[PDB]
Amino acid sequence: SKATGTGLVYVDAFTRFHCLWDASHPECPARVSTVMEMLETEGLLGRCVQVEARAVTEDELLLVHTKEYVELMKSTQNMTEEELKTLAEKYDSVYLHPGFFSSACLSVGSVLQLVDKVMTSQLRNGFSINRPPGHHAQADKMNGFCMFNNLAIAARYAQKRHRVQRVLIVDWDVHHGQGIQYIFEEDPSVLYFSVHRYEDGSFWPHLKESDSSSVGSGAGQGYNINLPWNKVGMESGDYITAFQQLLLPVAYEFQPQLVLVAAGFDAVIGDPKGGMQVSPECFSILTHMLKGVAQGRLVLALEGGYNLQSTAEGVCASMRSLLGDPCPHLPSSGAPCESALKSISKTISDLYPFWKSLQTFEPITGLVYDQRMMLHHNMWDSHHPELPQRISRIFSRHEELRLLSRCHRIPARLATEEELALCHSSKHISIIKSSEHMKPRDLNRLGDEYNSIFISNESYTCALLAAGSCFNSAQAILTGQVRNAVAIVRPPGHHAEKDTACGFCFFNTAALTARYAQSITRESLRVLIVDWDVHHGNGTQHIFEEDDSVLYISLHRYEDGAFFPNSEDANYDKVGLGKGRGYNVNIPWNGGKMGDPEYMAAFHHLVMPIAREFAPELVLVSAGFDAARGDPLGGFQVTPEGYAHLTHQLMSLAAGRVLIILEGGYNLTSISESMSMCTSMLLGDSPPSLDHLTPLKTSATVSINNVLRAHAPFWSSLRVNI
Numbered sequence: 001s002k003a004t005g006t007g008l009v010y011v012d013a014f015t016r017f018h019c020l021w022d023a024s025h026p027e028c029p030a031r032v033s034t035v036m037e038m039l040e041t042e043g044l045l046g047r048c049v050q051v052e053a054r055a056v057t058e059d060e061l062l063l064v065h066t067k068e069y070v071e072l073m074k075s076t077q078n079m080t081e082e083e084l085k086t087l088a089e090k091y092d093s094v095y096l097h098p099g100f101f102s103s104a105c106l107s108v109g110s111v112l113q114l115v116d117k118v119m120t121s122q123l124r125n126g127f128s129i130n131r132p133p134g135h136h137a138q139a140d141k142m143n144g145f146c147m148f149n150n151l152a153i154a155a156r157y158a159q160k161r162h163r164v165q166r167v168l169i170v171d172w173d174v175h176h177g178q179g180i181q182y183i184f185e186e187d188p189s190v191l192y193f194s195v196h197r198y199e200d201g202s203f204w205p206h207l208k209e210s211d212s213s214s215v216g217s218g219a220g221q222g223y224n225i226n227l228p229w230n231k232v233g234m235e236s237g238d239y240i241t242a243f244q245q246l247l248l249p250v251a252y253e254f255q256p257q258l259v260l261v262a263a264g265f266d267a268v269i270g271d272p273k274g275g276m277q278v279s280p281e282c283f284s285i286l287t288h289m290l291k292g293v294a295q296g297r298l299v300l301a302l303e304g305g306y307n308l309q310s311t312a313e314g315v316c317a318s319m320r321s322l323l324g325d326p327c328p329h330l331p332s333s334g335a336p337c338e339s340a341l342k343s344i345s346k347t348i349s350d351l352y353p354f355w356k357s358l359q360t361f362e363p364i365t366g367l368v369y370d371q372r373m374m375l376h377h378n379m380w381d382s383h384h385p386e387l388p389q390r391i392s393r394i395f396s397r398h399e400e401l402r403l404l405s406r407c408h409r410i411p412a413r414l415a416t417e418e419e420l421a422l423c424h425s426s427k428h429i430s431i432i433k434s435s436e437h438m439k440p441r442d443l444n445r446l447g448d449e450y451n452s453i454f455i456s457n458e459s460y461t462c463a464l465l466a467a468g469s470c471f472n473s474a475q476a477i478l479t480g481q482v483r484n485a486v487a488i489v490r491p492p493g494h495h496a497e498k499d500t501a502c503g504f505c506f507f508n509t510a511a512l513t514a515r516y517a518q519s520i521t522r523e524s525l526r527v528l529i530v531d532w533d534v535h536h537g538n539g540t541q542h543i544f545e546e547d548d549s550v551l552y553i554s555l556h557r558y559e560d561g562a563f564f565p566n567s568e569d570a571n572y573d574k575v576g577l578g579k580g581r582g583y584n585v586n587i588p589w590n591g592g593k594m595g596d597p598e599y600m601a602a603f604h605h606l607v608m609p610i611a612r613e614f615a616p617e618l619v620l621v622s623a624g625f626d627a628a629r630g631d632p633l634g635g636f637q638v639t640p641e642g643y644a645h646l647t648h649q650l651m652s653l654a655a656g657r658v659l660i661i662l663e664g665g666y667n668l669t670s671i672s673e674s675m676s677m678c679t680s681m682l683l684g685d686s687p688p689s690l691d692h693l694t695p696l697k698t699s700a701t702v703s704i705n706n707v708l709r710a711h712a713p714f715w716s717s718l719r720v721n722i
């Protein structure tokens with residue numbers, strides 16, 4: 001959706017209650033004022049839209065809590081310290097203050113205010129900097145510093161006031177939000193996900209129902225997901241793997257209309273309560289991942305987090321993601337630990353019968369375009385699909401959708417022969433160069449020496465412009481002129497080999513760009529090449545086959561070698577050679593038409609876990625749009641919204657340094673709409689609606705499992721297969 005702005009709720013009332021009988025109490029006013037001070041210091045506060053708090057009404061509290069409980073809580077405001085202590089002692093880990101009720105009402109109300117702004121598209125997203133927390137509060141009792149269940153009320157409120165059918169509650173606070181679990185235990189309309197320290201019940205709240213076996217009951221069976229950690233010192237790699245392999249597949253199947261986050265920061269490094277080692281930066285990635293599930297409709301509310309600085313950094317990292325700032329560099333490993341893999345696998349097995357998605361297992365944007373690249377043409381067949389108008393139609397669509405004016409225009413330039421020699425033989429360079437002065441008879445003769453190649457006197461210059469345009473784009477990204485970019489270029493490149501032209505490709509644009517990126521930074525710069533063109537990029541695979549500095553990932557229609565380029569080199573068992581073993585990932589599709597379900601599943605279980613463990617410094621996309629719905633050559637059904645979601649996933653890698661390079665794509669409308677959607681994502685627009693992602697075709701399930709088996713010894717994040 002086209003909503004903009006990040007809401008922030010903060011009122012002085014959030015500091016007007018504290019523990020009267022213990023000055024060392026961790027749940028203190030400084031928690032929220034430290035967060036507010038850092039947001040201001042980091043320049044984040046001034047970038048947010050200030051949203052006023054409001055007091056929750058009795059009717060809204062009654063959506064979750066009993067009348068008797070609400071009346072008892074109301075009466076605490078007139079109590080003495082002695083009366084407050086006597087009542088607090090009746091609950092587990094709770095204090096009371098005469099200002100507690102008033103602040104708790106404004107704490108619930110602040111979330112309802114953000115829910116209103118987000119559900120009416122006044123804002124895209126928001127964060128409530130509230131205290132007291134809420135996720136432990138139950139229908140009739142206080143618990144773990146909570147009086148009212150903020151998010152449980154907000155979810156039921158969203159359903160009643162804004163006609164939301166499905167709400168997803170994600171709880172990344174180090175403790176299990178048993179309050180939320182109990183309230184929605186039998187409710188299929190509210191999916192509750194909690195990741196928490198458990199240690200076989202030895203960690204507070206010491207509940208057997210905090211285990212992965214508690215999947216909900218009655219109509220709500222399968223709608224309660226617990227991810228218990230049974231070892232301390234969990235890191236960002238563990239949280240990110242859990243979101244990739246478990247939460248995202250389920251969330252996409254659930255299709256919520258709203259995402260609510262119980263945003264606790266007690267899992268962050270330095271928290272005295274948590275015992276975990278999660279970097280604050282991890283929360284930027286987690287927040288980014290949640291933007292894709294409800295078309296950006298995302299509300300975060302502060303839960304726990306007791307190290308003042310750690311909590312403030314966690315809030316700042318999440319806020320940066322909500323505002324659309326590029327994802328940060330992750331300071332730790334992209335690989336999960338064995339204990340985390342064990343917990344993720346157990347949760348997957350416990351929720352497996354309820355979710356088809358789990359049943360698979362056995363910033364500035366640059367734009368480059370030059371109309372001169374239209375000069376390359378087929379003089380013998382004017383209807384040949386690799387049309388000059390492919391690039392002009394894509395460019396026109398960017399102008400119609402007003403994307404062009406939002407981009408920084410990067411000039412096209414010719415690649416030099418020295419730059420072509422980064423990937424190609426001097427013999428191949430000279431043969432293509434010679435075509436510039438050839439008569440039509442000689443151009444026909446030369447084209448026939450290759451597999452699927454047409455040449456004109458303008459072909460060599462167009463191929464130099466396609467390569468040079470991508471080098472200028474990679475240079476703009478790596479020198480900080482832009483964060484990411486799109487290259488509307490032709491002829492394509494991924495079929496071109498070191499010593500030969502092939503399948504409409506003269507020079508390997510993506511391969512040359514990866515080597516060029518390395519020549520302007522360092523030889524070992526980690527480059528990820530994601531090739532989503534419907535055909536296997538045979539040339540790219542071969543160029544980097546023995547290389548561990550360039551990870552090549554291709555998704556392609558294979559059909560047991562019956563589809564172009566018709567070689568067994570495209571099969572899943574081709575994992576690379578020598579030090580490059582594990583750095584060549586082929587995802588071959590067999591048995592007809594694939595679409596968004598299969599592509600999203602391949603990204604959740606293969607592309608994203610491998611890419612995150614590789615930790616690229618630059619992401620290149622060999623973006624052919626010939627797997628698109630309507631393509632005359634591909635026969636596939638990837639929709640423009642499908643491509644937008646794939647682009648969105650890749651943006652959390654390489655601190656957002658993503659270059660989208662045009663490859664194939666032959667339906668002019670399909671490629672114009674698909675590539676425009678990718679640019680829209682790079683620009684930071686909310687991911688669009690994307691329904692019906694299950695069931696997958698049976699043969700796609702076979703393909704994904706074949707890949708997992710081939711790459712599991714190389715990549716730990718794949719060992720989620722028990």
Ligand SMILES: CCCCN(Cc1ccc(C(=O)NO)cc1)C(=O)Nc1ccccc1
Pocket residue numbers: 025026093094133136144145175204266273303304305
């Ligand atoms: C012996 C119990 C171990 C865990 N807890 C309880 C607890 C409950 C909730 C949260 C929380 O993060 N709530 O949002 C943190 C700790 C505590 O240690 N709580 C505590 C209570 C009073 C003073 C200092 C600490």
Ligand SMILES: CCCCN(Cc1ccc(C(=O)NO)cc1)C(=O)Nc1ccccc1
Pocket residue numbers: 384385452492495503504505535564626633663664665
């Ligand atoms: C017997 C060959 C079968 C595959 N090919 C060739 C081909 C090569 C490369 C690509 C491609 O997407 N290159 O970027 C697509 C098709 C074709 O079908 N090519 C074709 C040529 C003219 C008109 C219509 C289609």
Ligand SMILES: [Cl-]
Pocket residue numbers: 443444445447448453454455
């Ligand atoms: Cl020819």
Ligand SMILES: [K+]
Pocket residue numbers: 171172173174175176177194195196
């Ligand atoms: K939790």
Ligand SMILES: [K+]
Pocket residue numbers: 184185186187188190191192216220223224
């Ligand atoms: K539920």
Ligand SMILES: [K+]
Pocket residue numbers: 531532533534535536537554555556
């Ligand atoms: K491909």
Ligand SMILES: [K+]
Pocket residue numbers: 544545546547548550551552576580583584
């Ligand atoms: K490689």
Ligand SMILES: [Zn+2]
Pocket residue numbers: 173174175264266303304305
């Ligand atoms: Zn907590």
Ligand SMILES: [Zn+2]
Pocket residue numbers: 533534535624626663664665
């Ligand atoms: Zn192709």
